[PDB]
Ligand binder design. Structure first.
Ligand SMILES: [Cl-]
Ligand SMILES: [Cl-]
Ligand SMILES: [Cl-]
Lengths: 212, 216
């Protein structure tokens, strides 16, 4: 949200990661940063408060620092049990809100990094005959299990009518996701092309379909 | 030492829901408490805060004038009254303790309660073929669009075809309806000679469709 974190960090068991948290004068600049650990399917848990202080039970493997408008969570001796979403948080004095970063997914790597395979289908003749249009973006065999999906109508971003899944574990322990763009038939016919853009570990894989 | 949320569940758009959070700690009345929510697959969003004895309340602009935070210290209970609920309010709602040392931090969290804002009722899917485009392989599939509830079963050629088949987990849309897709990867040389049929069954709506998927 208001604070900026990298979507994904990863390392092998026993190795280290750093999670950056970027804000402004009115939040991180003037106020103390906390870090929250969210294990899969659980409530957040406080790890660190007042920038660098660990809560009870939290090992010295976890460390926090803060300089100006940025903060950093360090984790050394990575264990599979550390796999979680990590959130930075602080007070924002402009809005008088408690604010969070967008979350960082920590993967403790159990297999090689895999870029996603992307398949994009245009609307069927049958759906267009029913006066509707759905673009289907199928995303498979990626690891770690974190992607961002962006839709384009020619060169313009499309944010309306977008429905994207959370990544889910396939049988091979890689991840799958899908994204659906709802259009009018008129929108579909009027553009030169639509694109599904899948960003994984800082690289974008793009597929494009055209009504022609 | 714990917080436990209750009152979550299914509510129609425009409806109301009262969440409760029961606190075990004697110190409950001496601490600020908050509601934080998390939309499925998304980040934490702080919602509301209340002082020890309710003299001060804070709200995110996203819930201001629709939501009211309150507490009854005699019952060690925190409340969130949510009126005029919208689909974008669908989330796990957490109650948490807000404390100050040098600065602010949320040191104790409840388990969370799911709030689903939806008027989704039993509905069969529309099944559309995803035709193969005109590594010597073609992807073809079937779109299973706008059904409720889970689950649907998809097979290809009545289970004869398994290699190359990927049936994707369903998307739960803001509408509260599901969609899923199944894809099979086949040789481009096969498209002229082989028949590909996706077999879709949605038992709750008695919707069973065999859709032939052909080129173009
Ligand atoms: Cl107080
Ligand atoms: Cl008060
Ligand atoms: Cl502070």
């Amino acid at each position: 949200s208001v604070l900026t974190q990298p979507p994904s960090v990863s390392a092998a068991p026993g190795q280290k990661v750093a999670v950056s948290c970027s804000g402004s004068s009115s939040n991180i600049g003037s106020h103390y940063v906390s870090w929250y650990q969210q294990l899969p399917g659980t409530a957040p848990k406080l790890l660190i408060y007042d920038n660098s202080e660990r809560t009870s039970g939290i090992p010295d493997r976890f460390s926090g620092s803060k300089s100006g408008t940025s903060a950093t969570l360090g984790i050394t001796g990575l264990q599979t049990g550390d796999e979680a979403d990590y959130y930075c948080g602080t007070w924002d004095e402009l809005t008088s809100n408690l604010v969070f970063g967008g979350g960082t997914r920590l993967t403790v790597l159990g297999q090689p990094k895999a870029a996603p395979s992307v398949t994009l289908f245009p609307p069927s003749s049958e759906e267009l005959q029913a006066n509707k249009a759905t673009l289907v973006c199928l995303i498979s065999d990626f690891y770690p299990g974190a992607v961002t999906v962006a839709w384009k109508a020619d060169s313009s971003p499309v944010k309306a009518g977008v429905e994207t899944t959370t990544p889910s574990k396939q049988s091979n322990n890689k991840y799958a996701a899908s994204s659906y763009l709802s259009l009018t038939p008129e929108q579909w016919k009027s553009h030169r092309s639509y694109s599904c853009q899948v960003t994984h570990e800082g690289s974008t894989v793009e597929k494009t379909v055209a009504p022609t | 030492v714990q917080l436990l949320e209750s009152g979550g569940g299914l509510v129609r758009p425009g409806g109301s829901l009262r969440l409760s959070c029961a606190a075990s700690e004697f110190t409950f009345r001496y601490d600020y408490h908050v509601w934080v929510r998390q939309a499925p697959g998304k980040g934490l969003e702080w919602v509301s805060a209340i002082s020890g004895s309710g003299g001060s309340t804070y709200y995110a602009d996203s819930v201001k004038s629709r939501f009211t935070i309150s507490r009854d210290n005699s019952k060690n209970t925190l409340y969130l009254q949510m009126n005029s609920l919208r689909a974008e309010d669908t989330a796990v709602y957490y109650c948490a303790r807000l404390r100050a040392d040098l600065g602010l931090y949320m040191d104790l969290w409840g388990r969370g309660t799911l709030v689903t804002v939806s008027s989704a009722s039993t509905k069969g899917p529309s099944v559309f073929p995803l035709a193969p485009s005109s590594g010597g392989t073609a992807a073809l599939g079937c779109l299973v669009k706008d059904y409720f509830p889970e689950p649907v079963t998809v097979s290809w050629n009545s289970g004869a075809l398994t290699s190359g088949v990927h049936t994707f987990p369903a998307v739960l849309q803001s509408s509260g309806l599901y969609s899923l897709s199944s894809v099979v990867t086949v040789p481009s040389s096969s498209l002229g000679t082989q028949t590909y049929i996706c077999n879709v069954n949605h038992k709750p709506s008695n919707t069973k469709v065999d859709k032939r998927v052909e080129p173009k």
